[PDB]
Each structure stands twice: as C-alpha cells, then as structure tokens.
Amino acid sequence: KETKEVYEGEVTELTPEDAENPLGGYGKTISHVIVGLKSAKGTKTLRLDPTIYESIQREKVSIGDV
Amino acid sequence: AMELEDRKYWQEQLNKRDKKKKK
Known about the structure:
This is part of a larger assembly, with chains A and B.
Chain A: E1 14-19, E2 29-36, E3 45-48
Antiparallel strand pairs in A: 1-2, 2-3
Chain B: H1 3-18
C-alpha cells in the first residue's frame, strides 16, 4: 500500500515565467513555470520548477487541455 | 539573505490575482 500526490486539471496557458539570469549571461532564464488548473469541484493556479522544460518537450495533447 | 523569500512570496501572491480567471 502506498499513496501518491497528484495535481491535475486544465491549463489555461502553458508558458514559463522568464527571469533575470543569476549568472552573468543573456537570453531567457526561467525561474518558474505557471501552470493553469481547472477541474470540476475545485480549480486553482500554481507554478512549478522550470526543470519541467524537458517534461513539456513532448506531450502532444493540446494547449493545456488535460 | 531573508528578504528574497518575502520578495518572491509577495510577487507570486500579486501575480496569482490577475492570472486567476475571475473577471
């Protein structure tokens, strides 16, 4: 027996939140990725570690559908 | 050393309002 914690819903917009690079650099350095949430009987909005950039590399569903 | 925590929390708090689909 075990338990897992999962966040799920519908994403209004899938776009990482850019921020200044802590090291002397250029371009865009993501500090957080805002993920929209939408579910029946409960709906919020949250942000995540920009490491999911590789996770969002291949989903092939829609623009934040489920 | 501690001010960045408050800065991040408050900026996330203020960005959570307009991003919320309330209208």
